[PDB]
């Protein structure tokens, strides 16, 4: 019954809206000058950056990057809340619950980070600010290209014109992989993903009828996400060696023992 797949698509969009304070609908409204929302203060340079403080709520490159870390630890909270709402996930082995989040969480962050980006920059502080791609290309030697490959993916991925109702199922298909390193019982996971994959395929067909093979085209973008993550990992172990005075959050440290 396709009808059950609709009930499931709508249950997931519902939880996605509950769990994520800044949707793609809101971010796109901010980014394109709409009247449902308010204009962001732009940071493109060092003077704009500290004028952001008297308008929005230690070195600069270091501060920027620890901001992403902190925002990332917040997302992991939102993602983990979205996870629980996915039918079946809290029924699984607790070890596998940990393993699925561990490997899925960054692929999801980088998917939802694309919603905040256009080719010229990225929203920050709940959309109250916008920081140019160029301003992030002139930070430091170790922090010179630690945000560019998310832009490169984001620009290509945003070209599919996905909705929040599309992304809610896609993000759930990511978590429920089952080819993840260290899983105890895979088959119960593969059962949930098969279901989520049929919900997504019907969703894309209905929401994007003129869009040939959007389903497959979105599945290939999972290949892009894995490279971003493994590139970021390598980047991270360089930064922690050049910068021995940079604290990393133990939550991110615990996720990052992966590969």
Under the criterion CB under 6 A, does residue 55 sit at the interface with ligand KNA?
no
Under the criterion CB under 6 A, does residue 71 sit at the interface with ligand GH1?
yes
**Per the annotation, does 71 bind a ligand?**
yes
* Residue 240 three-state SS: helix
Under the criterion CB under 6 A, does residue 249 sit at the interface with ligand GH1?
no
Radius of gyration of the chain (CA): 19
- Residue 141: which residues within 8 A CB-CB, separation 6 or more? none
Provide the pairing of β-strand 121-124 with 129-132. antiparallel
Q: Which is nearer to ligand KNA, 38 or 63 (CB)?
A: 63
Q: How far apart are CA 237 and CA 124, in angstroms?
A: 25
**Per the annotation, does 256 bind a ligand?**
yes
Of these, 34, 38, 55, 63, which contacts ligand KNA (CB under 6 A)? 63
Length of the chain: 259
Q: Which stretch binds ligand KNA (CB under 6 A): 26-34, 63-71, 182-190, 208-216?
A: 63-71
Q: What is the DSSP letter of 235?
A: H
Q: After which residues is the chain broken (C to N over 2.5 A)?
A: 57
Encoded one letter per residue, x for contact with ligand GH1 by CB under 6 A and - for no contact, window 128-147 reads ---x----------------
Q: Residues in contact with ligand GH1, total (CB under 6 A)?
A: 15
Query: Shortest distance, CB of residue 4 to ligand KNA, whole angstroms?
Result: 41
User: CB 220: neighbour CB atoms within 10 A?
Assistant: 9
Residue of 179, 180, 170, 121 whose CA lies nearest to 150: 121
Alpha helical stretches, state H, the chain: 2-19, 24-31, 46-51, 60-85, 94-114, 148-158, 164-175, 186-207, 214-242, 250-255
Encoded one letter per residue, x for contact with ligand GH1 by CB under 6 A and - for no contact, window 180-219 reads ----------------------------------------
Q: How far apart are CA 58 and CA 140, in angstroms?
A: 14
Q: Which stretch binds ligand GH1 (CB under 6 A): 29-37, 65-73, 175-183, 190-198?
A: 65-73
**Per the annotation, does 177 bind a ligand?**
no
Provide the pairing of β-strand 41-43 with 121-124. unpaired
Under the criterion CB under 6 A, does residue 68 sit at the interface with ligand GH1?
yes
* 97 contact, one of ligand KNA, ligand GH1, none, CB 5-8 Å limit per kind: none
Q: Which is nearer to ligand KNA, 128 or 198 (CB)?
A: 128
Under the criterion CB under 6 A, does residue 72 sit at the interface with ligand GH1?
yes
Query: Shortest distance, CB of residue 72 to ligand GH1, whole angstroms?
Result: 3
Structure-token pair, residue 35: 């009247």
In the complex, the residues that contact ligand GH1 under the rule CB under 6 A are 64-65, 67-69, 71-72, 106, 109, 113, 122, 124, 131, 236, 252
In the complex, the residues that contact ligand KNA under the rule CB under 6 A are 63, 67, 70
């Amino acid at each position: 019954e396709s009808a059950d797949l609709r009930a499931l698509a709508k249950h997931l969009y519902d939880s996605y809206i509950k769990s994520f304070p800044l949707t793609k609908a809101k971010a796109r409204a901010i980014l394109t000058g709409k009247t449902t929302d308010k204009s962001p203060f732009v940071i493109y340079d060092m003077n704009s950056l500290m004028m952001g403080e008297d308008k929005i709520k230690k070195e600069v490159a270091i501060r920027i990057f620890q901001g992403c870390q902190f925002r990332s630890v917040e997302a992991v909270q939102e993602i983990t809340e979205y996870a629980k709402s996915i039918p079946g996930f809290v029924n699984l082995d607790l070890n596998d619950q940990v393993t699925l989040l561990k490997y899925g969480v960054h692929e999801i962050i980088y998917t939802m980070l694309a919603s905040l980006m256009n080719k010229d920059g990225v929203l920050i502080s709940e959309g109250q600010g916008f920081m140019t791609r160029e301003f992030l290309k002139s930070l430091r030697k170790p922090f010179g290209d630690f945000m560019e490959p998310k832009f490169e993916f984001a620009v290509k991925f945003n070209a599919l014109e996905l909705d929040d109702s599309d992304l809610a199922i896609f993000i759930a298909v990511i978590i429920l992989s089952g080819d993840r390193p260290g899983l105890l019982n895979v088959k119960p996971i593969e059962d949930i993903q098969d279901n989520l994959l049929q919900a997504l395929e019907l969703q894309l067909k209905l929401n994007h009828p003129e869009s040939s093979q959007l389903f497959a085209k979105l599945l290939q973008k999972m290949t892009d996400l894995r490279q971003i993550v493994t590139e970021h990992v390598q980047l991270l172990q360089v930064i922690k060696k050049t910068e021995t005075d940079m604290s990393l959050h133990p939550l991110l440290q615990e996720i990052y023992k992966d590969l």
